[PDB]
Amino acid sequence: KDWGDANANGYKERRAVLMNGIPVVECTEFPDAGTHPLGSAYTVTADDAKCRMVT
Amino acid sequence: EVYQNEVDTRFQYQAMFLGLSSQRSVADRSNTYRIDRLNTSSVKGRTSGVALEPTPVRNDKMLIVVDTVLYIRNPIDYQDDWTAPDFLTEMGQNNGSEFAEVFDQAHLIQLIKGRSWVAPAHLKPAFSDGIEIEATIDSDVTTQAGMEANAIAINQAHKAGIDELIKRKVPLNDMITLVSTEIYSLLLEHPKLFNKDWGDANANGYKERRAVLMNGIPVVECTEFPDAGTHPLGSAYTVTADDAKCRMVTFSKSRTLVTVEAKPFTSRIWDDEQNFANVLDCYAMYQVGERRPDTAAVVKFNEA
Amino acid sequence: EVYQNEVDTRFQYQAMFLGLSSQRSVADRSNTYRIDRLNTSSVKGRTSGVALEPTPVRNDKMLIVVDTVLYIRNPIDYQDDWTAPDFLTEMGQNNGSEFAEVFDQAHLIQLIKGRSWVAPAHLKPAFSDGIEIEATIDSDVTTQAGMEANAIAINQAHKAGIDELIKRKVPLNDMITLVSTEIYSLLLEHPKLFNKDWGDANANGYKERRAVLMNGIPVVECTEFPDAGTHPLGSAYTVTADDAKCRMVTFSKSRTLVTVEAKPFTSRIWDDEQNFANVLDCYAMYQVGERRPDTAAVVKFNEA
Amino acid sequence: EVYQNEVDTRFQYQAMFLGLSSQRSVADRSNTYRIDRLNTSSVKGRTSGVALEPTPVRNDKMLIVVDTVLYIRNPIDYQDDWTAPDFLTEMGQNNGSEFAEVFDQAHLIQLIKGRSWVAPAHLKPAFSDGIEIEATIDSDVTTQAGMEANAIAINQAHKAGIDELIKRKVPLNDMITLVSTEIYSLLLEHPKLFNKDWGDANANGYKERRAVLMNGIPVVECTEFPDAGTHPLGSAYTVTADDAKCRMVTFSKSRTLVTVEAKPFTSRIWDDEQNFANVLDCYAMYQVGERRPDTAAVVKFNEA
């Protein structure tokens, strides 16, 4: 859109885009390396770090 | 009771058509309602010495029957605690959202199917056929020239529908146009936003994206448009491929839709020893009727 | 009972001419109104006492009689209850809308028919002849060339009408233009003519599609406009082929028309023993008159 | 009141179809009735086996609505006396006979209409369609030469019909055959009547024509038989030439016809002051329905 929208989902996130009918929110807290502090279940692989969009 | 309140209040916050239709109720136990299609209300003049002729009855009133009950089934085992909080409340919200979505879906299917009405004899002077305005919008277009070419086509279709519907003596004060998400996105700027007055009076629960006022009437974005081939309520609501292409409808908020609530939303809990579960279900019976189909305008888009 | 209230409140809401013409009433049980046109000049200047002022006998008057009675006949069968089943009210708005449509239709009929008016009997210089404007709008085909050509024709016809009225000493403050639906639709496709001074985006207090400022005066679209060739008020309101072609009318809200209501809206219940249908009918006595046909502009569009 | 009782008591007599259909009544104010197409249910289910085997069976829900107000009108002059006995009773018997005649006529008309009824087998394959037994009956013929020529054709058509009904699990005892007056006349003085002449006349055949048994079922001549014309009930009972050619039909005691009587026999007196005559009329609203159109051994004859 010309401005996207004005109703941001997050209190500070760069939200309010609504491209394909639903809001799209920018996520700064995004994983890159496989050392998450929860165990081996949350370890990230090389391919798991290439997926940068979730719906 | 807590579960019943949660499912009920969700209607006031998401169900759009609770205020866009005549909320009638079937008082009789026959579960049938009679819609009076008034078609003999002409004005004549007794010029003294003239002799008048008797006025025949020419009202082809229609019948709507609540032959379907809508229900939701939630089997719950004994070990699980259904009465525990944070579960019924979460259950109530989802059930209410689904029920209101099906309500709006049924209403839109009714208007879409009421596009090729024939308006038979005994009604022709006061009743007309449906609206079949066509459009050719190419959604798959990224060029700025093509982007405005779709907007002008949509605006032209809306103008034609509004002109035709006004020609049939329908006040502009009572008009709402419903658009799909993709059509609403394809709309032009028209930044006139109806924050709390998109044809709804004393409404606070509803939260919609009616931020556009096309051609002097509110236009509201409806996310619940039919695109499949079936619908739970009844078997005459099976949306065809042609009926799925209609993505914008213009109708009247007081002369196009009537709803009958044969049974309100009641929650029932009953033990099931056979399968070892406490099945919880809430159900309600209702049916939507399209009185005066001539006051509804729809457009069938055709992507190039 | 409450049916009279329902048919009344709708009448005021829809009938735009309740404020566009003088409201009169025959309070003499004579079914006739003796209203006089005004032709008093400013022949003054006694000056010297020797010179004497001539005595004028220039007098004229008109009479309007309520010949026909306007009634609506509603056959109600014995089985259908009507005391207050939320149905007589619904029939109330329909009957009121029909009455308002007939009222506005009669007003437009008189406005169109008084466009010639010939000349008064004594040929008063104050009372000029009626105004008729010839225009040619190519409404049949608009291949992106006549769309703006027709709008120019409409604009120049409106300008000629406003100039002719201004020449006849009618203030710009009190003057409204009523236009047919098709001409209004052709007008909005070329919207640079409108002054874009909407503000309220409505009519002159009404709820019709109106360019509130065009050529200095509002241009309202009146759906109830003469198309047929027969009217309830009698043979004095029949329409010829030429009278139907006139699609736009300009006049003043305080001098052009006067309406008189001998009997208000009266509704009674009649138990028709024959046909087994007790009927409810509403009737009212009124008649309209073009007091000042000179202060009215009528434009006729003759195909292409 | 005395007039009403005279018509009612006479109506019970001579009404053949008063006991050949389900006498239902629309209890609710709404004049609509819903009844199941198939009331047959094999409740005889063996529970010896531990695991039951329920059979999914569905029945169409018929909808019958009363619309016509059947009436008979008798104008009584001012000087003549209507309340005097020996005149109310004489008028009452004729009115009751006419009502019974139109009752039987309507039932036969709807049966002939149900002759060519296509079964929605996709809803249900158990419900078969209407049956169309055809035969040729000699009209003129001769003496002792053509009398048995048409008689054998009629009799073999009768076997065809009864065999078709037996194939549909219709008990032989619940089976009645109604024929036209001329068909009954041709049946007599024939070898078919000479061989099958068991005159039971227990209940139905006593008051009416004697029930001559042919194939274990009564055969009764109905005086009130359809001809090529119309019916007072409405356009749904209009008779065609092909429909009038049907002269014999067989059906079931209580699975073929159903009647709903929203308004019983009621009468009122009003003064038709225009014609100087008190008008006394009796009116009643009822609509006959026909369940299970398959169970109708209707036969059509043609030529000679």
Give the amino acid at C295: T
Whether B54 contacts chain C with CB within 8 A: yes
How many B/D residue pairs have CB atoms within 8 Å?
A: 22
Say yes or no: C201 contacts chain B, CB-CB below 8 A: yes
Tokens 């213009």 locate to B250
Chain B contact set for C277 (CB, 8 A): 57
Structure tokens at B110: 């009714």
Contacts of D92 (CB under 8 A, 6+ apart): D3, D5, D6, D7, D10
Contact flag A21-B189 (C-beta cutoff 8 Å): no
CA distance B45 to chain A (A): 57
Residues of B in contact with C87 (CB under 8 A): 36
- Within chain D, where are the H helices? 2-12, 88-115, 147-167, 181-187, 191-195, 204-207, 241-244
Chains that touch D (3 or more CB pairs under 8 A): B, C
Test C181 with B169 for CB contact under 8 angstroms.
no
Residue C231 tokens read as 């009217």
Cβ contact C181–B171 (<8 Å): no
Q: Which residues of B are less than 8 Å from D52 in CB distance?
A: none
- Chain C residues inside the 8 Å CB shell of B41: 72, 74, 91, 94-95, 98
DSSP-based three-state secondary structure for B173: coil
CA-to-CA distance for C128 and D133, rounded, in angstroms?
A: 85
Q: Which of B148, B179, B181, B224 to mutate to test the interface with A (most CBs of A within 10 A)?
A: B181
The span from the CA of B37 to the CA of B40, in Å, is 9
Nearest to B28 among D29, D61, D65 (CB): D29
Helices (H), strands (E): how many in chain D? 7, 15
C277-289 and C258-272 beta bridge pairing: antiparallel
Give which of C105, C104, C101 is closest to C7, Cα–Cα: C101
* Phi and psi torsions of D57, nearest 5°: -125, 140
Residues in chain D whose C lies over 2.5 Å from the next residue's N (breaks after): none
In a mutagenesis test of the B interface, which of D25, D32, D66 is the best target, namely the one with the most B β-carbons within 10 Å? Answer: D32
Contacts of D139 (CB under 8 A, 6+ apart): D303, D304
Give the closest residue to C10 by CA, choosing from C99, C71, C84.
Answer: C99
**Hey, what are B300's tokens?**
């069938």
E-assigned strand segments in chain D: 22-24, 32-36, 61-65, 70-77, 133-136, 176-179, 198-199, 212-213, 219-221, 246-251, 258-260, 266-272, 277-284, 287-289, 299-302
Q: Do B44 and C232 touch (CB under 8 A)?
A: yes
Contact between chain B and chain D (3 or more Cβ pairs less than 8 Å apart): yes
Helix, strand and coil content of chain A, in percent to the nearest 5, comes to: 5, 0, 95
Q: Which residue of C has its CA nearest to D278?
A: C273
Q: How far is D255 from chain C (nearest CA, A)?
A: 30
C76 to chain D, minimum CA–CA distance in Å? Answer: 13
8 A C-beta contact, residue B263 and residue B284: yes
- Looking at the complex, report in whole angstroms how far the Cα of residue B181 sits from the nearest Cα belonging to chain A: 6
In chain D, what's the furthest Cα-to-Cα distance?
A: 82
Task: Please spell the DSSP secondary structure of B241-267, one letter per residue.
Answer: HHHHTEEEEEE-TTTS-EEEEEEEEEE
- Which of D29, D31, D69 shows the shortest C-beta gap to C276? D69
The C-alpha atoms of residue D191 and residue B175 are separated, in whole angstroms, by 78
- Scanning every residue of chain C, which has its alpha carbon at the shortest distance from the alpha carbon of D29? C79
Contact C298, C160 (CB under 8 A): no
Q: Is D63's Cβ below 8 Å from some Cβ in B?
A: yes
Q: Is C78 on the interface with D (CB under 8 A)?
A: yes
D30 vs C: CB within 8 A: no
Residue D172 class from Cβ within 10 Å (0-12 exposed, 13-18 middle, 19+ buried)?
A: exposed
In chain C, residues with a C-beta closer than 8 Å to the C-beta of B55 are: 73, 75, 279
Q: Do B41 and C90 touch (CB under 8 A)?
A: no
D282 three-class SS: strand
A and D make contact (3+ CB pairs below 8 Å): no
Find the residue in A nearest to B182 (Cα). A21
Alpha carbon of residue B179 to chain centroid: 12
DSSP element (H, E) containing B96: helix B88-113
- Chain D touched by C87 (CB under 8 Å): no
Give the residue carrying structure tokens 């009479």.
C63
Closest residue on chain D to C78 (Cα): D69
Chains in touch with A (3+ beta-carbon pairs under 8 Å) read B
**How far apart are the C-alpha atoms of D269 and D4, rounded to whole Å?**
12
State the resolution, in angstroms: 3.5
Cβ–Cβ gap C276/D71 under 8 Å: yes
Q: Of the candidates C98, C208, C274, which has its C-beta nearest B43's C-beta?
A: C98
Query: Taking CB atoms and an 8 Å cutoff, what residues of chain C touch B44?
Result: 70-73, 232
